[PDB]
Enzyme design. Sequence first.
Site, short mmCIF file in Angstrom:
data_model
loop_
_atom_site.label_atom_id
_atom_site.label_comp_id
_atom_site.label_asym_id
_atom_site.label_seq_id
_atom_site.Cartn_x
_atom_site.Cartn_y
_atom_site.Cartn_z
N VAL A 1 27.66 27.63 7.69
CA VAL A 1 28.00 26.29 8.16
C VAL A 1 29.12 26.35 9.21
O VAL A 1 29.22 25.49 10.10
CB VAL A 1 28.39 25.37 6.97
CG1 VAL A 1 29.67 25.84 6.30
CG2 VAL A 1 28.51 23.92 7.42
N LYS A 2 29.94 27.39 9.13
CA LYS A 2 31.10 27.51 10.00
C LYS A 2 30.74 27.72 11.48
O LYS A 2 31.58 27.52 12.36
CB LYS A 2 32.01 28.62 9.51
CG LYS A 2 32.47 28.44 8.07
CD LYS A 2 33.38 27.24 7.91
CE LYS A 2 33.60 26.83 6.45
NZ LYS A 2 34.30 27.78 5.51
N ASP A 3 29.50 28.09 11.74
CA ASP A 3 29.04 28.19 13.12
C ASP A 3 29.17 26.85 13.82
O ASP A 3 29.32 26.78 15.04
CB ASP A 3 27.60 28.69 13.16
CG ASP A 3 27.39 29.96 12.35
OD1 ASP A 3 28.35 30.75 12.21
OD2 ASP A 3 26.27 30.15 11.83
N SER B 1 33.17 26.80 14.45
CA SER B 1 33.46 27.89 15.37
C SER B 1 33.08 27.52 16.79
O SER B 1 33.79 27.85 17.74
CB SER B 1 32.72 29.15 14.95
OG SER B 1 33.20 29.63 13.71
#
EC number: 4.2.1.22
Lengths: 489, 486
Positions: free
Chosen positions: A76-78, A81
């Site tokens: 999910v951090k994409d 980021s």
Amino acid sequence: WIRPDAPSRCTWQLGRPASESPHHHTAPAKSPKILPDILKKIGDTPMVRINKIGKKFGLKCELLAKCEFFNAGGSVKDRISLRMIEDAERDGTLKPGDTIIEPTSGNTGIGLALAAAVRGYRCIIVMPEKMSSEKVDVLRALGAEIVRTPTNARFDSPSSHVGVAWRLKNEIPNSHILDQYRNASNPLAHYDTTADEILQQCDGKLDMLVASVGTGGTITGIARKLKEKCPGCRIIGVDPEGSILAEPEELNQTEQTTYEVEGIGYDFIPTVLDRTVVDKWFKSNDEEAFTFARMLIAQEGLLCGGSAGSTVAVAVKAAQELQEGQRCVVILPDSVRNYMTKFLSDRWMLQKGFLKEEDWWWHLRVQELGLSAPLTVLPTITCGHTIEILREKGFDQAPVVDEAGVILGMVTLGNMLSSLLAGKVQPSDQVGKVIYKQFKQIRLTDTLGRLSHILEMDHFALVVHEQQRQMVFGVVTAIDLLNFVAAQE
Amino acid sequence: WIRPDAPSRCTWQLGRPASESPHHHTAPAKSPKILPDILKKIGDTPMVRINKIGKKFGLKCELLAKCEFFNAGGSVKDRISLRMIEDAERDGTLKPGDTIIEPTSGNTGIGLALAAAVRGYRCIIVMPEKMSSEKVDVLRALGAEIVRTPARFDSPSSHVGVAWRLKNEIPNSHILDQYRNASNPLAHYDTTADEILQQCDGKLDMLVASVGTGGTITGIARKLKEKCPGCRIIGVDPEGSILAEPEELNQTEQTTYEVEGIGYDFIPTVLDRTVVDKWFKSNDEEAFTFARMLIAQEGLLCGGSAGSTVAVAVKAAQELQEGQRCVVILPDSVRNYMTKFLSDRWMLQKGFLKEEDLKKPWWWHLRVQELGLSAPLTVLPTITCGHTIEILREKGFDQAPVVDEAGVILGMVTLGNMLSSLLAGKVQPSDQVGKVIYKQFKQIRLTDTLGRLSHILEMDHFALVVHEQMVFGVVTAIDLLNFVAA
Ligand code: HEM
Ligand code: HEM
Ligand SMILES: C[S@@+](CC[C@H](N)C(=O)[O-])C[C@H]1O[C@@H](n2cnc3c(N)ncnc32)[C@H](O)[C@@H]1O
Ligand SMILES: C[S@@+](CC[C@H](N)C(=O)[O-])C[C@H]1O[C@@H](n2cnc3c(N)ncnc32)[C@H](O)[C@@H]1O
Ligand SMILES: *Cc1c(COP(=O)(O)O)cnc(C)c1O
């Protein structure tokens, strides 16, 4: 240095029109036929209905799953980021060729190292030393650089995974720290995009959302957008045991603060986290997390991580209040790619004692082998005379022992050799330096099955006097077992 | 039993109208807001332009990449695993609660185990006994069941024949046979090639694909040759594979390669080599190099076969000029290769990686001929395992060569292999030793470095000194250690 748990200065309040927001807001994007780069694959994640697990536990409602492991980096951090960078790039804070330093392990550092690799930024990920080889290998492969900080050193300490990143930030030119805990881009990413996707895919109608809580940007941005445009929807937060994020504080009472689940829960309340938009909190553990993760993979065919298991394990409880005709959406954070050698491995699940499965000569005792009288060595002889003897008798080792017979360790040939390739030892100096402590010790009264396990795992195990662990009765290898079997068959 | 390499009976010919086709044809599907199950995520894969690697090697053209690792299982085979099943389900061949046996250890087992897990079929995957942990753990996690088969293509006891034995022995069991099944190339003919044509607006001047069973490249090349004549199709074959044409290219010493998923010793039924305009030979080095280059520069998380595809692409697309287009097929993700080409240690151990930081020990560039190794003790294939255990007892080694009477060494036997097989109950002390023959082993020669030897002995317990096909002896660590510390 600024603390990540510093109270939020955000004046956002439910009911306030969106025209008053000082921040920058993006929108979900129509995706092209041909992507200009892989970063455009981030977002527009699929919503998959859960058909089996919902009904198995007696849910009358509809249970959907928001799968963020289909993001280009597999987490999910994409989303953030990208956002944190795309904002900085706009702000003039981030220049071409710059360095992005982050105090993260695995879930954000991957997204950041990917974006940095694509856009030509040097990336520095700072973390403890024993980080799992999956995440570490992905990072090194993407071109990122790793800084190993000490395993035991505090958050407030000057030598941790975070403070040291700030020291590098000051020391290294053009270096920036986006600070996922404090950065508004984190919850704004989900507020602008994710929550709009969820609302589009669900036609604006859903009656519950269950999310696992990490830094808290996800659940915050989502719960805010929802509370605005879908009032009836209840927001359910998930917190592991050992974490204080959950409310009320009475739920946060536990003995140990350590948990195997990765990505959720740490000791402090981040800035971006809004606990006033969370309608109820639930406490999960590692067992039901990994159990429900394996259950998701097996039954639903969804390849995901343990946090997903926590989310769902809570969901089957929280959605019981929901009746037929309603809808419940859960957030599935990441893929199984990082956990290949952890919860996906039966051996590992056994070792931590989660599933703990049960276990013609298998229950026969190692005693029946009748092994040789050990050759042990002094810590004090040279490596040359050492492999001289070990060449003479065709034995690979020592229990490395003191003058009292007490085991100081063991030493094997391959270990010596790799120690030579590194150049950290030479034939002159004592063998006492190369002592190999990472072997396994099992003995006489043990079953031949466990021994067999170790023998396909390692080269050997070590028979100790039953009730003296500092004593060596003998050395066991596969050839003596094969001797036993070929003998009595 | 039917042979997978059996000649194709398809009467399809270029120029024949599509109305004449006896097969069933699907179309690419509009995907829903909410997926009813994860299997609907298979297909509609993204096309990503390659910005860096193309220009770095001097391509004037546009280089696009068809990424099949975004499929729900993380491989291209999810396309066929679906199709082969969806056809069988329609045919009445496949019933609810049935067993799908497949002898592949490839991605097909993953795709199939996934579809079986979703739809409630028992899945049986039959494969060799080494089988790197990633794939095995994925399979066991999906609910599939594994059969270890100690490898030989047309053998009675192999990864394939025993699956047919189970197929006959087990009720309701079917073998879809990815090599012979028309559903395999039809999947790509109907869907993949239509996606490629939609995304590229019907215009592309080259397509580069790595060749496995061959269904992909076949179906695609057929659909393209029909609707886009100018497009040239370029096939990729590893060294040690005979799939490539002409046969002159297939000449090599070793038949063993580390790249997973491509190349075979046989020509599958589904493979049409008349639709491939040119073939290229790739190796493992440039495969893994270009894979790391894809991950690093382009941010594309993929496998080694992708690296082979692209390594060939930068060569084959040189003929292309500015304004044109080239599309490559990226088969799978890095998820299976986490501990293999993604690991620097592994890349070093196999000798692909580059050596120096600019200083190290003097014996490095010395060679193993200086080690002064003695005669190896050879074992006959017909010998009893217990006897092997006796001789190898008294001499005290962990491994021995398995050689026939005619002198040609068919392989090696290791104690871990014998023990592994015995624990599975697939060998007994009175059995032929010829059963436990271990065909995947590493070769260091007389004239190779002591460094390479070292790296080898960090991977595995031995390697085998050869004077030129002929031999010298067997080498393990204690001879190196004895030499250096002398
Ligand atoms: C009408 C809507 C909103 C208004 C008027 C508003 C206003 C503000 C203001 C005045 C600040 C103080 C900045 C400072 O003191 O340096 C702030 C900070 C912040 N806002 Fe908002 N905001 C809104 C919506 C949101 C939303 C939807 C999110 C996230 C989903 C968000 C996340 C944050 C964060 C993380 C901070 C930083 C707080 C800190 O650094 O202590 N805001 N906002
Ligand atoms: C006008 C188009 C086509 C016609 C008229 C046609 C006709 C046929 C015929 C008559 C057979 C013989 C069946 C048998 O003997 O068992 C066959 C087999 C087959 N076809 Fe086609 N075909 C067409 C297109 C295609 C395409 C586009 C594909 C794949 C992309 C394909 C793949 C196959 C395969 C794999 C077989 C099995 C051959 C074997 O089992 O030896 N065909 N086809
Ligand atoms: C001759 S060695 C052969 C090589 C084998 N890999 C190994 O190191 O044991 C095998 C025999 O030596 C015994 N052995 C190995 N290490 C020994 C040691 N340090 N002292 C006494 N016996 C040993 C084993 O238990 C087995 O019976
Ligand atoms: C005695 S064994 C000790 C155990 C060791 N792990 C091994 O298998 O080589 C080591 C010595 O035996 C040699 N050796 C191993 N297998 C051999 C075989 N099949 N024929 C002749 N020498 C062999 C090695 O090259 C080395 O000099
Ligand atoms: C199967 C496979 C291929 C080749 O695809 P085909 O369908 O056989 O043409 C390429 N790469 C990998 C990883 C594969 O498994």
